[PDB]
Design an enzyme around this catalytic site. Structure first.
Site, PDB file in Angstrom:
ATOM      1  N   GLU A 184      -5.089  -8.712   0.779  1.00  0.00           N
ATOM      2  CA  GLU A 184      -5.826  -8.378   1.989  1.00  0.00           C
ATOM      3  C   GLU A 184      -7.295  -8.184   1.652  1.00  0.00           C
ATOM      4  O   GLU A 184      -7.637  -7.586   0.623  1.00  0.00           O
ATOM      5  CB  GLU A 184      -5.315  -7.089   2.667  1.00  0.00           C
ATOM      6  CG  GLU A 184      -3.941  -7.159   3.275  1.00  0.00           C
ATOM      7  CD  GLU A 184      -3.528  -5.837   3.938  1.00  0.00           C
ATOM      8  OE1 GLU A 184      -2.308  -5.582   4.093  1.00  0.00           O
ATOM      9  OE2 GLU A 184      -4.435  -5.058   4.314  1.00  0.00           O
ATOM     10  N   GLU A 228       0.816  -1.214   0.000  1.00  0.00           N
ATOM     11  CA  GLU A 228       0.000   0.000   0.000  1.00  0.00           C
ATOM     12  C   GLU A 228       0.852   1.268   0.000  1.00  0.00           C
ATOM     13  O   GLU A 228       0.768   2.105   0.895  1.00  0.00           O
ATOM     14  CB  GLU A 228      -0.946   0.001   1.192  1.00  0.00           C
ATOM     15  CG  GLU A 228      -1.725  -1.298   1.313  1.00  0.00           C
ATOM     16  CD  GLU A 228      -2.889  -1.121   2.229  1.00  0.00           C
ATOM     17  OE1 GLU A 228      -2.853  -0.160   3.044  1.00  0.00           O
ATOM     18  OE2 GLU A 228      -3.846  -1.910   2.127  1.00  0.00           O
TER      19      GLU A 228
HETATM   20  O1  LIG Z   1      -6.124  -1.423  10.560  1.00  0.00           O
HETATM   21  P1  LIG Z   1      -7.124  -0.695   9.676  1.00  0.00           P
HETATM   22  O2  LIG Z   1      -6.880   0.807   9.686  1.00  0.00           O
HETATM   23  O3  LIG Z   1      -8.556  -0.998  10.098  1.00  0.00           O
HETATM   24  O4  LIG Z   1      -6.936  -1.262   8.152  1.00  0.00           O
HETATM   25  C1  LIG Z   1      -6.726  -2.662   8.028  1.00  0.00           C
HETATM   26  C2  LIG Z   1      -5.539  -2.924   7.194  1.00  0.00           C
HETATM   27  O5  LIG Z   1      -5.419  -1.754   6.301  1.00  0.00           O
HETATM   28  C3  LIG Z   1      -4.368  -1.967   5.299  1.00  0.00           C
HETATM   29  O6  LIG Z   1      -4.284  -0.757   4.707  1.00  0.00           O
HETATM   30  C4  LIG Z   1      -3.015  -2.309   5.939  1.00  0.00           C
HETATM   31  O7  LIG Z   1      -2.193  -2.892   4.914  1.00  0.00           O
HETATM   32  C5  LIG Z   1      -3.074  -3.295   7.088  1.00  0.00           C
HETATM   33  O8  LIG Z   1      -1.890  -3.113   7.876  1.00  0.00           O
HETATM   34  C6  LIG Z   1      -4.238  -3.083   7.993  1.00  0.00           C
HETATM   35  O9  LIG Z   1      -3.957  -1.882   8.734  1.00  0.00           O
END
Ligand SMILES: O=P(O)(O)OC[C@H]1O[C@@H](O)[C@H](O)[C@@H](O)[C@H]1O
Ligand SMILES: O=P(O)(O)OC[C@H]1O[C@@H](O)[C@H](O)[C@@H](O)[C@H]1O
Lengths: 474, 474
Positions: free
Chosen positions: B374, B166
């Site tokens: 993810e 990301e």
């Molecule tokens: O933890 P959040 O803000 O709910 O988002 C969930 C996920 O978001 C993505 O952008 C990241 O790659 C992860 O590390 C995790 O953070």
């Protein structure tokens, strides 16, 4: 701050052979599929046909003088295949070549750049009779031979060429909707003819690279940019399906030599995919155009459509507003009225921001220069005492589309030129003579041929001022 | 007529080192920018940090045993750069490499495929101190040294690699929104650091081709597909702007090595475009990846935004629903609530069809295979007596996305795998520990580490069953 239009921007106007020329059986010209089709009962509005059209074949000197008076930088016109090869195949008709040579000479003597369209829907009937025209691979060698003839003869004086005009329209209308010749409604034949037309386009672009090494060539696509009706995921998905099936299906082939995969898999699941032969991909992928030609009139808004939903819809061929109905592909998408735009009396959306959107999508996806080969407003015109045609509706339509082109240029879209449809009034294939697009009114209607006299409309003078200021004053 | 998931579809789950590992100063590990940043007052939820996290560094054997119980085909994790190079670019900390070697061996002994993320936001603080980390071209060689160190140590055993997780998030949050390290709010600096990160991505892909010639590598983009609010042309144009500025700006570079032109011209118009050195374009264009890694959680719906309109919005970091506000770029677009989708307690849209749309857009534009690195649902979980966690909301979310993936595969999208976020509960950078994503509940919260015991949630057994039936049974 807007970018200016580039110094050699091609301010143009356009026509098509069958719609303007007439002289349908003069000086050795053969029968075209439209000569036959338009004379079949019920195919055209009030039985209109192009036997005479606006008689441009005999009055081209007067018409070019009106172009010079307007100050046109460019005139886009098509060569009638049947005039040049009456049988499509055999001996060249030198009288036919001589007319376009006379026309090109007249254009260049007045300082107007010719843009020549190789194919604008009038394949000789002899080819349809001999082997089914676009449904046979023989048309590839025959179309190529005809284009190389024109290249050789006029490549020294014509720099900008269009291969196929709106392949997506004459293939779809002729083989799926049955509204164009050959009047077929067969999706399987449609995609076979479409694939052959793709190969013909690529073959002649390759020939063009040999015979006109200093020229610029491309197809002209009938581009309606799709919109989703709203942010419902199922309608955005319908928009994805509609843009890929209606637009990428052609423009991806033009630009990358490949069909889009989701539409291909969907056709293949139904046995509707075209027959590919060895060498086809190599040919399609080895034929890069110099530009994407774009014919633009309107955007289309879509929504989700169930597997048992809308298929063919009513098309407005009468100018009676509000008579067209939604069309679609069951399961994929259906059209829907866009409540945020006005429409013409033929129910066409007026959406000049749609043109900027469309130019941006092509630049962003294909990185190609764009030649806008058609844009215009088809409406009723009234002749008033004193030879006055007050077509403010048409001035405002064109003004807003030209303004959005300058924004797209400012956004970085390389627009090579703009050809308004049309220079004079002409015969609309399915709508007759009352659906007028011209800067120059032609004195005839669907009941009376009258005298075909040319009359400058208010929009003639508006566009004259646009060209003089290179678009600085609209 | 749905196609099945491919025989060796990588059913996975994912984590990131800073969120999971703990042991922040053990076994020679150096400080990362997140060790420093999260200990600054006000930067994280209730002052939470990853000093301990869920202590995966010490408990990895337990966690991998649970992965094997679940039957995971693949486990995606990141390597903590400051474990391996405590000062970022000096001598290697062998104990740091030994941890990932033990982890990889533990995975492979249980038949689980490692998927290694090189960079998940934790550049060592020494590089930030020495030269500003991602704002200096020095990071290109330092990231390459780190990547090749891992390629040589683990390339025999790891075939799937992710370069930058990301980039669009850690660059924009760190340099435009000031919510990640280094806490900068400067659009010019953001686009410079972003361009350097593009170069670093391309450089490591080039190295990868030499050191892991049989491997697969790609970046993992945080993809929120954009929707127009309705068919108003101005809102469709805002959607074109949004998709280009938010998504094409990164994915066009990843796939084609080129920035999109309309966004470039807009930045160039304000002097925000990055500084391009000679050789940059050649590097970016000569580093094709094997797949587009896609992190997907939600779509975004946009409408027009006047030049005096919305800029920064409020982001929900508390789990109180309805606290987010609109954000946008004045003149280009603003986000708007999509009335057709549900939202989470953190105001994230729930849009499984948007994943199908996003997959189709990448396949159609770039013709690349996709690894979904993810996807998951962050929500409050309740631990009930008897160590029961009934997260039917998570099962429902995951089930509907996996169904839309299967429909995208049937459309012809080549999807290599699916890594659910996350395997165990872990620290959410800005949301603390209460925003849980795991298949496995970890017993701790924002106020106490408790015993960090692992507890299988209902979704654990649902996914086990998905994997057993290769997605036939959802
Ligand atoms: O933890 P959040 O803000 O709910 O988002 C969930 C996920 O978001 C993505 O952008 C990241 O790659 C992860 O590390 C995790 O953070
Ligand atoms: O005449 P119509 O149906 O109004 O369309 C207007 C024009 O647009 C395209 O479809 C054709 O290339 C033109 O030949 C002309 O027909």
């Amino acid at each position: 701050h807007l970018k200016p239009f580039p110094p050699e921007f091609l301010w143009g106007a356009a026509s098509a052979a069958y719609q303007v020329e007439g002289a349908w059986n003069e000086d050795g010209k053969g029968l075209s599929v439209w000569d036959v089709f338009a004379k079949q009962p019920g195919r055209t509005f009030k039985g209109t046909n192009g036997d005479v059209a606006v008689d441009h074949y005999h009055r081209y000197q007067e018409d070019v003088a009106l172009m010079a008076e307007m100050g046109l930088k460019a005139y886009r016109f098509s060569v009638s295949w049947s005039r040049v090869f009456p049988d499509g195949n055999g001996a060249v008709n030198e009288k036919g070549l001589d007319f376009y040579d006379r026309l090109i000479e007249e254009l260049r003597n007045h300082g107007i750049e010719p843009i020549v369209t190789l194919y604008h829907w009038d394949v000789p009937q002899a080819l349809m009779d001999a082997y089914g025209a676009w449904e046979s691979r023989r048309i590839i060698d025959d179309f190529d031979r005809y284009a190389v003839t024109l290249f050789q003869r006029f490549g020294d004086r014509v720099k900008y060429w269009v291969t196929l005009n709106e392949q997506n329209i004459f293939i779809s209308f002729g083989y799926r909707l049955g509204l164009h010749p050959p009047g077929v409604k067969d999706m399987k034949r449609m995609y076979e003819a479409n694939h052959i037309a793709n190969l013909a386009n690529a073959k002649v672009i390759q020939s063009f690279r040999h015979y006109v090494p200093d020229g610029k060539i491309g197809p002209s696509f009938a581009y309606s940019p799709m919109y989703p009706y709203d942010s419902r995921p199922e309608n955005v998905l319908a928009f994805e399906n509609a843009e890929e099936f209606q637009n990428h299906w052609w423009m991806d082939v033009y630009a990358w030599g490949m069909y889009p995969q989701a539409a291909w898999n969907y056709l293949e699941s139904q046995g509707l995919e075209p027959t590919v032969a060895p060498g086809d991909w190599e040919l399609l992928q080895a034929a890069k155009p110099d530009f994407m030609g774009v014919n633009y009139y309107q955007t289309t808004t879509v929504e989700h459509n169930p597997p048992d939903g809308v298929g063919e819809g009513v098309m407005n061929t009468t100018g009676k507003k509000g008579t067209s109905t939604s069309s679609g592909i069951p399961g994929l998408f259906k059209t829907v009225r866009n409540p945020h735009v006005d429409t013409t009396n033929w129910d066409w959306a007026i959406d000049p921001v749609g043109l900027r959107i469309g130019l941006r999508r092509i630049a962003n996806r294909y990185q190609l220069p764009i030649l806008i080969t058609e844009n215009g407003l088809g409406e009723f015109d009234t002749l008033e005492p004193g030879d006055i045609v007050n077509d403010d509706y048409r001035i405002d339509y064109l003004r807003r589309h030209v303004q959005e082109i300058q924004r797209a240029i400012t956004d970085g879209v390389d627009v090579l030129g703009y050809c308004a449809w049309s220079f004079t009034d002409l015969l609309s294939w399915l709508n007759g003579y009352q659906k007028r697009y011209g800067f120059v009114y032609v004195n005839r209607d669907d009941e009376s041929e009258k005298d075909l006299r040319r009359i400058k409309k208010k929009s003639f003078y508006w566009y004259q001022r646009v060209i003089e200021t290179n678009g600085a004053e609209l």
